[PDB]
Tab-separated table of C-alpha atoms and ligand atoms in Angstrom:
chain	number	residue	atom	x	y	z
A	45	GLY	CA	-49.275	48.252	15.446
A	46	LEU	CA	-49.641	50.330	12.188
A	47	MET	CA	-46.229	48.835	11.091
A	48	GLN	CA	-46.847	46.627	8.022
A	49	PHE	CA	-43.802	44.610	6.854
A	50	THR	CA	-43.421	45.040	3.038
A	51	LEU	CA	-41.197	43.388	0.472
A	52	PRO	CA	-39.621	44.579	-2.772
A	53	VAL	CA	-42.041	44.120	-5.705
A	54	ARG	CA	-40.569	40.861	-7.144
A	55	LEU	CA	-40.700	39.264	-3.596
A	56	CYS	CA	-44.147	40.751	-2.819
A	57	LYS	CA	-45.606	38.992	-5.962
A	58	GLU	CA	-43.536	35.759	-5.990
A	59	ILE	CA	-43.899	34.995	-2.196
A	60	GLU	CA	-47.590	34.125	-2.957
A	61	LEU	CA	-46.545	31.289	-5.320
A	62	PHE	CA	-45.759	27.735	-4.110
A	63	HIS	CA	-42.357	27.626	-6.010
A	64	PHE	CA	-40.935	30.831	-4.329
A	65	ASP	CA	-37.265	30.491	-3.173
A	66	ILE	CA	-36.518	32.749	-0.127
A	67	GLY	CA	-33.056	33.601	-1.650
A	68	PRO	CA	-29.475	33.731	-0.301
A	69	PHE	CA	-29.852	36.899	1.874
A	70	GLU	CA	-30.171	35.372	5.402
A	71	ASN	CA	-30.900	38.824	6.998
A	72	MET	CA	-34.136	39.033	4.904
A	73	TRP	CA	-35.537	35.668	6.181
A	74	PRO	CA	-36.941	36.996	9.532
A	75	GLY	CA	-38.704	39.835	7.626
A	76	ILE	CA	-40.073	37.329	5.087
A	77	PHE	CA	-41.534	35.206	7.963
A	78	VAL	CA	-43.107	38.239	9.760
A	79	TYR	CA	-44.592	39.318	6.384
A	80	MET	CA	-46.178	35.831	6.073
A	81	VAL	CA	-47.529	35.807	9.680
A	82	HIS	CA	-49.019	39.315	9.192
A	83	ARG	CA	-50.848	38.281	5.962
A	84	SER	CA	-51.838	34.646	6.837
A	85	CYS	CA	-52.797	35.476	10.483
A	86	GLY	CA	-53.079	39.319	10.955
A	87	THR	CA	-50.868	42.198	12.341
A	88	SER	CA	-52.811	41.489	15.622
A	89	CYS	CA	-51.890	37.735	16.019
A	90	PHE	CA	-48.601	38.394	17.905
A	91	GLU	CA	-46.900	41.336	19.639
A	92	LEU	CA	-44.155	42.372	17.142
A	93	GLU	CA	-41.434	42.740	19.870
A	94	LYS	CA	-42.190	39.220	21.295
A	95	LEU	CA	-42.459	37.663	17.759
A	96	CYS	CA	-39.124	39.200	16.700
A	97	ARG	CA	-37.405	38.003	19.891
A	98	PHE	CA	-38.912	34.491	19.371
A	99	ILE	CA	-37.750	34.314	15.651
A	100	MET	CA	-34.164	35.321	16.599
A	101	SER	CA	-33.973	32.675	19.439
A	102	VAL	CA	-35.347	30.057	17.003
A	103	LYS	CA	-32.672	31.039	14.426
A	104	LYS	CA	-29.901	30.821	17.101
A	105	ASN	CA	-31.054	27.224	17.945
A	106	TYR	CA	-30.687	25.962	14.318
A	107	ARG	CA	-27.156	24.641	13.616
A	108	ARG	CA	-24.866	25.352	10.606
A	109	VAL	CA	-25.575	21.963	8.963
A	110	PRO	CA	-25.853	21.636	5.153
A	111	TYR	CA	-29.654	20.967	4.890
A	112	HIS	CA	-31.520	20.890	8.288
A	113	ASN	CA	-30.752	24.579	8.965
A	114	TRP	CA	-32.505	27.927	9.432
A	115	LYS	CA	-33.004	28.320	5.625
A	116	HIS	CA	-34.928	24.967	5.590
A	117	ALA	CA	-37.093	26.164	8.522
A	118	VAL	CA	-38.166	29.386	6.700
A	119	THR	CA	-38.592	27.463	3.384
A	120	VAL	CA	-40.977	24.961	5.096
A	121	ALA	CA	-42.903	27.920	6.727
A	122	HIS	CA	-43.250	29.625	3.281
A	123	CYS	CA	-44.778	26.432	1.735
A	124	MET	CA	-47.251	26.350	4.700
A	125	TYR	CA	-48.004	30.087	4.094
A	126	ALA	CA	-48.803	29.283	0.432
A	127	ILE	CA	-51.126	26.360	1.485
A	128	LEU	CA	-52.911	28.562	4.104
A	129	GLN	CA	-53.340	31.527	1.686
A	130	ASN	CA	-54.815	29.244	-1.073
A	131	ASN	CA	-57.318	27.631	1.472
A	132	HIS	CA	-58.393	30.836	3.324
A	133	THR	CA	-61.652	29.540	4.877
A	134	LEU	CA	-60.667	25.897	5.792
A	135	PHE	CA	-58.493	26.719	8.860
A	136	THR	CA	-59.314	27.997	12.376
A	137	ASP	CA	-57.608	31.144	13.850
A	138	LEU	CA	-55.525	28.907	16.211
A	139	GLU	CA	-54.420	26.721	13.230
A	140	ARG	CA	-53.241	29.861	11.292
A	141	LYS	CA	-51.221	30.948	14.457
A	142	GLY	CA	-49.864	27.459	15.328
A	143	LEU	CA	-48.858	26.076	11.908
A	144	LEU	CA	-46.389	28.799	10.706
A	145	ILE	CA	-44.706	28.585	14.139
A	146	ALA	CA	-44.717	24.739	13.943
A	147	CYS	CA	-42.987	24.972	10.523
A	148	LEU	CA	-40.364	27.534	11.744
A	149	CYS	CA	-39.603	25.259	14.787
A	150	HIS	CA	-40.055	21.764	13.221
A	151	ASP	CA	-36.267	20.926	12.977
A	152	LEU	CA	-34.942	23.032	15.934
A	153	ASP	CA	-31.427	21.950	17.054
A	154	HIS	CA	-31.172	19.311	14.271
A	155	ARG	CA	-27.637	17.856	14.256
A	156	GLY	CA	-27.603	16.592	10.588
A	157	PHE	CA	-28.299	12.926	11.624
A	158	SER	CA	-31.381	10.632	11.272
A	159	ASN	CA	-33.317	9.042	14.182
A	160	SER	CA	-31.700	5.760	13.009
A	161	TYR	CA	-28.095	7.129	13.492
A	162	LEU	CA	-28.930	8.482	17.025
A	163	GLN	CA	-30.272	4.970	17.958
A	164	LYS	CA	-27.128	3.232	16.618
A	165	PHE	CA	-24.756	5.783	18.245
A	166	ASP	CA	-26.789	5.354	21.524
A	167	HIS	CA	-27.192	9.158	21.827
A	168	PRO	CA	-28.864	10.307	25.109
A	169	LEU	CA	-31.911	11.644	23.058
A	170	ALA	CA	-32.567	8.003	21.869
A	171	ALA	CA	-33.011	6.912	25.552
A	172	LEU	CA	-35.257	9.945	26.330
A	173	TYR	CA	-37.444	9.492	23.126
A	174	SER	CA	-37.574	5.900	21.810
A	175	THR	CA	-39.510	6.847	18.610
A	176	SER	CA	-39.665	10.055	16.542
A	177	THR	CA	-36.450	10.908	18.502
A	178	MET	CA	-35.449	14.192	16.782
A	179	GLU	CA	-39.082	15.287	16.371
A	180	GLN	CA	-39.801	14.967	20.127
A	181	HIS	CA	-36.584	17.008	20.678
A	182	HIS	CA	-37.718	19.726	18.185
A	183	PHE	CA	-41.090	20.114	20.039
A	184	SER	CA	-39.163	20.180	23.385
A	185	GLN	CA	-36.833	22.996	22.074
A	186	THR	CA	-39.964	24.870	20.872
A	187	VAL	CA	-41.548	24.858	24.413
A	188	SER	CA	-38.142	25.861	25.947
A	189	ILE	CA	-37.909	28.964	23.664
A	190	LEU	CA	-41.618	29.900	24.263
A	191	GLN	CA	-40.819	29.910	28.047
A	192	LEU	CA	-37.813	32.314	27.825
A	193	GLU	CA	-38.571	35.841	29.291
A	194	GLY	CA	-40.326	38.035	26.644
A	195	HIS	CA	-40.657	35.092	24.136
A	196	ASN	CA	-44.235	33.944	24.902
A	197	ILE	CA	-45.953	34.955	21.624
A	198	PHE	CA	-49.153	33.077	22.738
A	199	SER	CA	-49.529	35.058	26.075
A	200	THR	CA	-52.777	36.768	24.759
A	201	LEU	CA	-54.540	33.298	24.428
A	202	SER	CA	-56.783	31.754	27.184
A	203	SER	CA	-55.365	28.691	29.092
A	204	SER	CA	-57.383	26.305	26.820
A	205	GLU	CA	-56.508	28.162	23.546
A	206	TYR	CA	-52.816	28.039	24.665
A	207	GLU	CA	-53.155	24.232	25.332
A	208	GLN	CA	-54.886	23.784	21.924
A	209	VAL	CA	-52.175	25.752	19.965
A	210	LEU	CA	-49.282	23.831	21.692
A	211	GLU	CA	-51.184	20.592	20.881
A	212	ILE	CA	-51.511	21.652	17.197
A	213	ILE	CA	-47.714	22.424	17.170
A	214	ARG	CA	-46.729	19.136	18.882
A	215	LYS	CA	-48.772	17.011	16.436
A	216	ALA	CA	-47.565	19.076	13.389
A	217	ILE	CA	-43.906	18.641	14.453
A	218	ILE	CA	-44.233	14.881	15.264
A	219	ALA	CA	-45.916	14.388	11.821
A	220	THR	CA	-42.628	15.527	10.117
A	221	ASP	CA	-41.162	12.106	11.081
A	222	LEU	CA	-41.340	10.579	7.546
A	223	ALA	CA	-41.631	7.073	9.225
A	224	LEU	CA	-45.196	8.189	10.273
A	225	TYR	CA	-46.130	9.732	6.882
A	226	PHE	CA	-46.728	6.407	4.957
A	227	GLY	CA	-49.520	5.212	7.290
A	228	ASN	CA	-50.949	8.733	7.684
A	229	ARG	CA	-51.275	9.127	3.890
A	230	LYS	CA	-52.749	5.550	3.455
A	231	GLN	CA	-55.448	6.339	6.063
A	232	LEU	CA	-56.155	9.700	4.365
A	233	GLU	CA	-56.355	7.999	0.902
A	234	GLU	CA	-58.927	5.409	2.216
A	235	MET	CA	-61.026	8.095	4.071
A	236	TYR	CA	-61.123	10.353	0.930
A	237	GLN	CA	-62.116	7.393	-1.394
A	238	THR	CA	-64.797	5.830	0.926
A	239	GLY	CA	-66.095	9.413	1.530
A	240	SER	CA	-65.637	9.056	5.355
A	241	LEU	CA	-63.209	12.084	5.408
A	242	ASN	CA	-64.713	14.777	7.729
A	243	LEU	CA	-62.901	18.077	8.582
A	244	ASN	CA	-65.196	18.567	11.665
A	245	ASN	CA	-63.657	15.325	13.062
A	246	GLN	CA	-60.597	16.618	15.034
A	247	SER	CA	-58.636	13.350	14.419
A	248	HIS	CA	-59.308	13.781	10.632
A	249	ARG	CA	-58.061	17.436	10.728
A	250	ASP	CA	-54.976	16.158	12.649
A	251	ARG	CA	-54.230	13.697	9.787
A	252	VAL	CA	-54.728	16.455	7.103
A	253	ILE	CA	-52.399	18.857	9.030
A	254	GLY	CA	-49.876	15.978	9.321
A	255	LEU	CA	-49.925	15.561	5.495
A	256	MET	CA	-49.619	19.387	5.008
A	257	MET	CA	-46.473	19.178	7.258
A	258	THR	CA	-44.959	16.378	5.101
A	259	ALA	CA	-45.845	18.397	1.944
A	260	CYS	CA	-44.111	21.558	3.342
A	261	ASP	CA	-41.110	19.568	4.651
A	262	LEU	CA	-40.556	17.979	1.194
A	263	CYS	CA	-41.175	21.288	-0.735
A	264	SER	CA	-37.593	21.264	-2.254
A	265	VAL	CA	-39.080	18.852	-4.884
A	266	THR	CA	-41.711	21.542	-5.878
A	267	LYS	CA	-39.217	24.326	-6.777
A	268	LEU	CA	-37.665	25.427	-10.101
A	269	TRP	CA	-35.313	22.605	-11.212
A	270	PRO	CA	-32.048	24.517	-10.323
A	271	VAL	CA	-33.359	25.032	-6.712
A	272	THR	CA	-34.416	21.342	-6.521
A	273	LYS	CA	-31.053	20.097	-7.898
A	274	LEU	CA	-28.836	22.381	-5.682
A	275	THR	CA	-30.920	21.560	-2.565
A	276	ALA	CA	-30.456	17.804	-3.363
A	277	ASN	CA	-26.644	18.482	-3.090
A	278	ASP	CA	-27.208	19.812	0.486
A	279	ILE	CA	-29.453	16.779	1.349
A	280	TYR	CA	-26.704	14.347	0.240
A	281	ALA	CA	-23.905	16.371	1.969
A	282	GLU	CA	-25.772	15.517	5.230
A	283	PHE	CA	-26.669	11.891	4.296
A	284	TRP	CA	-23.080	11.123	3.210
A	285	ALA	CA	-21.617	12.581	6.460
A	286	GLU	CA	-24.010	10.253	8.379
A	287	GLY	CA	-22.899	7.359	6.090
A	288	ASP	CA	-19.273	8.187	7.109
A	289	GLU	CA	-20.343	8.141	10.826
A	290	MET	CA	-22.117	4.754	10.267
A	291	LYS	CA	-18.844	3.314	8.787
A	292	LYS	CA	-16.961	4.697	11.878
A	293	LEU	CA	-19.394	2.603	14.011
A	294	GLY	CA	-18.538	-0.515	11.833
A	295	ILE	CA	-21.973	-0.439	10.051
A	296	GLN	CA	-22.424	-0.469	6.204
A	297	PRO	CA	-24.772	2.527	5.680
A	298	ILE	CA	-27.821	2.227	3.332
A	299	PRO	CA	-26.913	3.315	-0.261
A	300	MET	CA	-28.724	6.736	0.179
A	301	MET	CA	-25.992	7.610	2.785
A	302	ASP	CA	-22.924	6.009	1.087
A	303	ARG	CA	-20.868	8.611	-0.838
A	304	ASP	CA	-19.222	5.644	-2.693
A	305	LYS	CA	-22.686	5.018	-4.335
A	306	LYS	CA	-23.194	8.587	-5.820
A	307	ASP	CA	-23.950	6.929	-9.245
A	308	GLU	CA	-27.204	5.508	-7.704
A	309	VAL	CA	-28.560	9.014	-6.754
A	310	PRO	CA	-30.669	9.728	-9.902
A	311	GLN	CA	-32.506	6.329	-9.460
A	312	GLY	CA	-32.774	6.988	-5.655
A	313	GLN	CA	-34.459	10.340	-6.472
A	314	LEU	CA	-36.902	8.481	-8.864
A	315	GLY	CA	-37.837	6.018	-6.019
A	316	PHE	CA	-38.280	8.976	-3.643
A	317	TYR	CA	-40.569	10.912	-6.028
A	318	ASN	CA	-42.625	7.736	-6.783
A	319	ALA	CA	-42.721	6.324	-3.164
A	320	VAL	CA	-42.899	9.593	-1.129
A	321	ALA	CA	-43.263	12.958	-2.878
A	322	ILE	CA	-45.809	12.238	-5.715
A	323	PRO	CA	-48.248	10.292	-3.482
A	324	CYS	CA	-47.926	13.093	-0.803
A	325	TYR	CA	-48.921	15.919	-3.215
A	326	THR	CA	-51.549	13.679	-4.993
A	327	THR	CA	-53.460	13.031	-1.709
A	328	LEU	CA	-52.930	16.673	-0.643
A	329	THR	CA	-54.407	17.874	-3.997
A	330	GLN	CA	-57.455	15.540	-3.563
A	331	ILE	CA	-58.153	16.993	-0.096
A	332	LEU	CA	-57.166	20.630	-0.854
A	333	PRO	CA	-57.607	21.228	-4.596
A	334	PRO	CA	-55.862	24.652	-4.625
A	335	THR	CA	-52.495	22.909	-3.655
A	336	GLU	CA	-52.389	21.309	-7.170
A	337	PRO	CA	-49.363	23.503	-8.253
A	338	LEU	CA	-47.203	21.531	-5.718
A	339	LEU	CA	-48.131	18.222	-7.456
A	340	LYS	CA	-47.566	19.729	-10.949
A	341	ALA	CA	-44.093	21.103	-9.908
A	342	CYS	CA	-43.169	17.744	-8.278
A	343	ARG	CA	-44.056	15.883	-11.497
A	344	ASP	CA	-41.938	18.415	-13.516
A	345	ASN	CA	-38.940	17.699	-11.183
A	346	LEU	CA	-39.515	13.910	-11.543
A	347	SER	CA	-39.270	14.402	-15.353
A	348	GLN	CA	-35.941	16.333	-14.808
A	349	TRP	CA	-34.462	13.374	-12.742
A	350	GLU	CA	-35.636	11.068	-15.576
A	351	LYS	CA	-33.623	13.344	-17.988
A	352	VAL	CA	-30.544	13.071	-15.686
A	353	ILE	CA	-30.728	9.201	-15.900
A	354	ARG	CA	-31.063	9.323	-19.757
A	355	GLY	CA	-27.809	11.439	-19.955
A	356	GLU	CA	-29.835	14.439	-21.437
A	357	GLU	CA	-28.425	16.221	-18.260
N	93	JT9	C1	-35.405	15.331	-2.139
N	93	JT9	C2	-35.576	14.812	-0.754
N	93	JT9	C3	-36.277	15.440	0.223
N	93	JT9	CL1	-37.111	16.909	-0.112
N	93	JT9	C4	-36.384	14.965	1.528
N	93	JT9	C5	-35.790	13.810	1.804
N	93	JT9	CL2	-35.962	13.086	3.360
N	93	JT9	C6	-35.068	13.082	0.822
N	93	JT9	N1	-34.393	11.953	0.838
N	93	JT9	C7	-33.895	11.855	-0.433
N	93	JT9	C8	-33.031	10.699	-0.806
N	93	JT9	C9	-33.710	9.746	-1.779
N	93	JT9	C10	-32.846	8.564	-2.084
N	93	JT9	N2	-31.658	8.755	-2.599
N	93	JT9	C11	-30.886	7.630	-2.847
N	93	JT9	C12	-29.607	7.783	-3.384
N	93	JT9	C13	-28.832	6.663	-3.646
N	93	JT9	C14	-29.321	5.393	-3.393
N	93	JT9	C15	-30.602	5.212	-2.876
N	93	JT9	C16	-31.373	6.330	-2.595
N	93	JT9	N3	-32.632	6.205	-2.056
N	93	JT9	C17	-33.429	7.241	-1.776
N	93	JT9	O1	-34.554	7.079	-1.320
N	93	JT9	N4	-34.179	12.854	-1.235
N	93	JT9	N5	-34.921	13.647	-0.403
N	94	MG	MG1	-37.167	16.835	10.628
N	95	ZN	ZN1	-37.560	19.478	8.000
């Protein structure tokens, strides 16, 4: 237990910043995650052997899809790491433990298709989980991996601490259904403005963690422009494949998923920043001031999409 994970100097310094990109070396991603657990939680939070075995089963249960893959999982965990490290004293020991795991697991066994496409295809998961279909599946895959021999990283917790941490993870993962984000953020906006927001109220904390999960999930829009732009290419590679699968079912896909409407992407990105990303990081910054760099980076990326529309890119 005297085994610190360390990182080369550039990674050691840059991992602390919100805009860090975990890089193209897949074999370094498990080490990067353990490094983040050790610093945001402690070398004592998890047994190394169990944690390592859990990480590698999680990786194996992400598919080789263009965007909703193992790289996305670690990227979303790093954004959470950055939020937790900039808000040291606001989070409980169980929240520290639960949230990095929730982020690593939040898209487990994603197939590259929306809840909407599973409902239209009539996939078995759509009959098992009528709303937040993929997100209920991701939580289900998380419990399955935690129950494999030698994979229970929470085995040192009491029965009630264990139930609390799995409840934090379930809610965090469900919150990554962007259909739920709009109402969650509106409620948080009203509570912050009327001054009713109270972090001792468990159902208020739940809403704030939900928004943190949206913020981490969307964190592609908070990177250096070349990261943002190249990640958008992966996002559309998925959306357009789903669009193709919609046309195979005899359904005109929405424009966001129709590869024949590529020309509309820059304006689609503008809508997305204005309707989803900017309001997400605005409310997050109001509640947790030290997350302001996420909002500032998002606004810089919106200005870059504006440049793309004006033909200056
Ligand atoms: C960057 C990013 C993240 Cl991080 C996560 C998610 Cl879910 C996401 N979805 C989009 C697509 C936005 C979008 N493109 C469109 C393209 C063409 C026509 C209409 C569109 N209408 C849209 O709304 N970008 N995106
Ligand atoms: Mg998801
Ligand atoms: Zn995700």
